[PDB]
Point group: C2
């Protein structure tokens, strides 16, 4: 059996967002949780390469307009949370230089957050 | 005004998934759509570094069990789609070596896919 629908056929959108490629990511939060100096460009011998980092701005879900079709924005909180991933950056934080994991936001997805605090 | 709820206070989970760190990503689909030879390890002069890539397996949403609370699995298709990001890999596909964007799945999020094809 090959499920082409609910995989490729259908729809995979609810909340939209925009990711811009920045080479000026001078600092970023690493895996450990430390905001390390990423600089923006990696120095390979005598050649520097500005790495395209993703700055993702969440946008107000246009395919559903109000909130998120399905999620009750009264009982729950239809919110587009920013999904961030761990990319590799040549940072000079300690010793000389190391390729560490830094957290960059790469998408915004709608999730039903729970009402508890006003 | 500082919205701590619907941002930090609340809940941000609906579909769970697991990302494993692999250093044996020998090939991956680049930004252009070509499955390039990533090898798995980057060669920096005389030092090779196996880059931790993310292989994310989608899991059956346990916080909601059946499908996705809010999404009607009869009218719509509650499906956890795998969100993939563009990481940088030193590939030897052309000339000598270049740091290209390759697509790796980093998360799985539930979206109401549309019924159309069976």
């Amino acid at each position: 059996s090959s499920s082409h629908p609910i995989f490729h056929r259908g729809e995979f959108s609810v909340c939209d967002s925009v990711s811009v490629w920045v080479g000026d990511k001078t600092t970023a939060t690493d895996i450990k949780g430390k905001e390390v100096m990423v600089l923006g460009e990696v120095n390979i011998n005598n050649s520097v390469f500005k790495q395209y980092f993703f700055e993702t701005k969440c946008r107000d879900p246009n395919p559903v307009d109000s909130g998120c079709r399905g999620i009750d924005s009264k009982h729950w909180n239809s919110y587009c949370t920013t999904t961030h991933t761990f990319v590799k950056a040549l940072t000079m934080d300690g010793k000389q230089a190391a390729w560490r994991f830094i957290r960059i936001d790469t998408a915004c997805v709608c999730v039903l957050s729970r009402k508890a605090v006003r």
